Amino acid sequence: ALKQVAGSLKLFLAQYREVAAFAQFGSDLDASTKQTLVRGERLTQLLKQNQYSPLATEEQVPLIYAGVNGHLDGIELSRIGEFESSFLSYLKSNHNELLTEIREKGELSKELLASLKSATESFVAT
Amino acid sequence: ATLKEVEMRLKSIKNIEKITKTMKIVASTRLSKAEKAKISAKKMDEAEQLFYKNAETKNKELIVAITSDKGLCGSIHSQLAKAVRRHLNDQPNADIVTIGDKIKMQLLRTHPNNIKLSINGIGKDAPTFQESALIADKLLSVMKAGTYPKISIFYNDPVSSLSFEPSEKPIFNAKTIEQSNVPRDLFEYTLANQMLTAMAQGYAAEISARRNAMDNASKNAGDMINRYSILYNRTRQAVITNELVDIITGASS
Amino acid sequence: AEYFRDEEGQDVLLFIDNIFRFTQAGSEVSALLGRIPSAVGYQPTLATDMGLLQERITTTKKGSVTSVQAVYVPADDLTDPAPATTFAHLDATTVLSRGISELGIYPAVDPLDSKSRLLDAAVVGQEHYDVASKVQETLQTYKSLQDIIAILGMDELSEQDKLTVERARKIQRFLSQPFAVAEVFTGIPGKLVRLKDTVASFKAVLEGKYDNIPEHAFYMVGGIEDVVAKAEKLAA
């Protein structure tokens, strides 16, 4: 389940490492590089974690799903953590069946892949 | 040449090389924007030169010299200064209007007498019609451009993305264009457009030259990195050997 | 040499080539004599052995000994204990350098590391001292600009830095000189330059009188007169 979503993360973070050298010259950068910075900064913020606070995979895969598929781009970076802690609280009361199925099966069916999109956009609406 | 010294110098040159590569790609980016203004200006300049060509117009002096005043452009400013000096030695009586601080510095290191106040600071970006028209008006009112028997404009022609050439162009005064009040206004307007196109070509040449200069800088820094990596490996082996010799001598006392 | 100095009362030239081989020789036997090796394997007694030898060479009230010594530098490492300890024993030093040699600048003397007691305004006069100090300032500026010249090239230097680098390059090449001994394998006729002529030539070069001469006209000639003559031959 984590391998399915974490695939492009590994590539986006490398592209971010390459482009971050350009941030000091931001005035004359391509829109593609602007998008790359927007995505990579939010991915880097998303991977912060507090001590003594380990997450189960059921809680990890939704967060990395939101990060990888760009749902974070519409959120101000300075509160991505506030998003994440809230987002999980949403999933654990609405769509808790999805977390149960991620725990039980350990893999994402196409139904679950679509449901993650639907739930993520339902939350990110607010 | 301690291991720490070599490692620090190697890291410094690595930082320089990365900076130069980044600037090289940034220059390649600005080149795409510059090309559009260059094309736009070139169309209009050719269109209005076709009038003087069809009319078969032909020929104290006013020499305008165009550079951006930006550094790290390499051979740009010195090449244009060379061309300007070669021209000026044939007509020392000419008064000069340098656009750009660097070329003003060039024509103050040599032939300082020929200009009191240079036009500086405005040559940053691709030519705006407002800026070019205002500079032409300054030449007319401040430089008394309306009076000179002969006018020349020097700029760097962007011969290629990889090369450029110092180039000079005449402007026929109102009394000069009369031969095959309207001529005076058209003279001022033609000077404005000619200067705009020359400044566009200069901007394109500047950005191309900066691209190539940063490319060369990055390649040179890479060569230096190779040399200092070799030296670092040698120093590493030497340090290990010397420390181990000290230890072995201590043991075998 | 000491018998000539003390008993004959004469003036003696004493050439030694190569004194490092004395120190090295002791090291070869040091381990067999049962001594514990010193740093980088030299004998413990290096400093006192070399003092006992070299300070016999001194001139005295009985007579004068003018001693010229060649010192090897292992692996070009001037920090090696033997050259490092030998430096303390000399009035004049001439540090030949591979870095200068690779440029083709024979006799390859390093003009900054080479140093002498007598380069003193009270000995050589104020003009000679001023010329030498200005030469070394120019050369040091040029050496300080090496990294910039390598990476960015000449164009981005300050204009007076450009002028200083040009004069430094010309001074570098003007310090080269063809010896008659090397003529066998260089093919360049031997040349000899008087002291006053040298000072005048370098003062003229510093003052910019010959800025218009191409730098290759300075390579392997003696005196500014030969510089101008070679400028003529290059113009032909």
Swiss-Prot record, chain A:
Give the subcellular location.
Mitochondrion inner membrane
Q: Which residues form a coiled coil?
A: none
Q: Which domain of life is it from?
A: Eukaryota
Family, per entry? Belongs to the ATPase alpha/beta chains family.
- What job does this protein perform? Mitochondrial membrane ATP synthase (F(1)F(0) ATP synthase or Complex V) produces ATP from ADP in the presence of a proton gradient across the membrane which is generated by electron transport complexes of the respiratory chain. F-type ATPases consist of two structural domains, F(1) - containing the extramembraneous catalytic core, and F(0) - containing the membrane proton channel, linked together by a central stalk and a peripheral stalk. During catalysis, ATP synthesis in the catalytic domain of F(1) is coupled via a rotary mechanism of the central stalk subunits to proton translocation.
- Subunit notes for this chain? F-type ATPases have 2 components, CF(1) - the catalytic core - and CF(0) - the membrane proton channel. CF(1) has five subunits: alpha(3), beta(3), gamma(1), delta(1), epsilon(1). CF(0) has three main subunits: a, b and c.
Please tell me what else the database record remarks about this protein: Present with 41500 molecules/cell in log phase SD medium.
Q: What name is this protein filed under?
A: ATP synthase subunit alpha, mitochondrial
The major lineage groups are: Eukaryota, Fungi, Dikarya, Ascomycota, Saccharomycotina
Question: What's the gene?
Answer: ATP1
Location of this fragment in the whole protein = 419 to 544 of 545
Curated annotation (Swiss-Prot), chain B:
BP term (GO), one = proton motive force-driven ATP synthesis
Return the CDD domains for the record. Answer: F1-ATPase_gamma
Q: How is the protein disposed in the membrane?
A: Peripheral membrane protein
Checking Pfam families in the record gives: ATP-synt
User: Keywords for this entry?
Assistant: ATP synthesis, CF(1), Hydrogen ion transport, Ion transport, Membrane, Mitochondrion, Mitochondrion inner membrane, Transit peptide, Transport
Q: Where in or outside the cell is it found? A: Mitochondrion; Mitochondrion inner membrane
Instruction: Write out the GO MF terms.
Output: proton-transporting ATP synthase activity, rotational mechanism
A GO CC annotation recorded here is: mitochondrial inner membrane
Query: So what does mutating I247T actually do?
Result: In ATP3-1; dominant suppressor of the slow-growth phenotype of yme1 strains lacking mitochondrial DNA
Q: Which domain of life is it from?
A: Eukaryota
NCBIfam families on file: ATPsyn_F1gamma
Q: What else is known?
A: Present with 28100 molecules/cell in log phase SD medium.
PANTHER family from the UniProt entry: ATP SYNTHASE GAMMA CHAIN, ATP SYNTHASE SUBUNIT GAMMA, MITOCHONDRIAL
Q: Quaternary state and partners of this protein? A: F-type ATPases have 2 components, CF(1) - the catalytic core - and CF(0) - the membrane proton channel. CF(1) has five subunits: alpha(3), beta(3), gamma(1), delta(1), epsilon(1). CF(0) has three main subunits: a, b and c.
Record family assignment: Belongs to the ATPase gamma chain family.
The protein's job, in short, is: Mitochondrial membrane ATP synthase (F(1)F(0) ATP synthase or Complex V) produces ATP from ADP in the presence of a proton gradient across the membrane which is generated by electron transport complexes of the respiratory chain. F-type ATPases consist of two structural domains, F(1) - containing the extramembraneous catalytic core, and F(0) - containing the membrane proton channel, linked together by a central stalk and a peripheral stalk. During catalysis, ATP synthesis in the catalytic domain of F(1) is coupled via a rotary mechanism of the central stalk subunits to proton translocation.
Name of this protein: ATP synthase subunit gamma, mitochondrial
From Swiss-Prot, chain C:
| Subcellular localization | Mitochondrion; Mitochondrion inner membrane
Residues carrying Phosphoserine: S101
UniProt subunit comment: F-type ATPases have 2 components, CF(1) - the catalytic core - and CF(0) - the membrane proton channel. CF(1) has five subunits: alpha(3), beta(3), gamma(1), delta(1), epsilon(1). CF(0) has three main subunits: a, b and c.
Q: Which family is this protein grouped under?
A: Belongs to the ATPase alpha/beta chains family.
Function per UniProt: Mitochondrial membrane ATP synthase (F(1)F(0) ATP synthase or Complex V) produces ATP from ADP in the presence of a proton gradient across the membrane which is generated by electron transport complexes of the respiratory chain. F-type ATPases consist of two structural domains, F(1) - containing the extramembraneous catalytic core, and F(0) - containing the membrane proton channel, linked together by a central stalk and a peripheral stalk. During catalysis, ATP synthesis in the catalytic domain of F(1) is coupled via a rotary mechanism of the central stalk subunits to proton translocation.
Q: What other facts are recorded?
A: Present with 164000 molecules/cell in log phase SD medium.
The name this protein carries in UniProt is ATP synthase subunit beta, mitochondrial
Q: Which organism is it from?
A: Saccharomyces cerevisiae (strain ATCC 204508 / S288c)
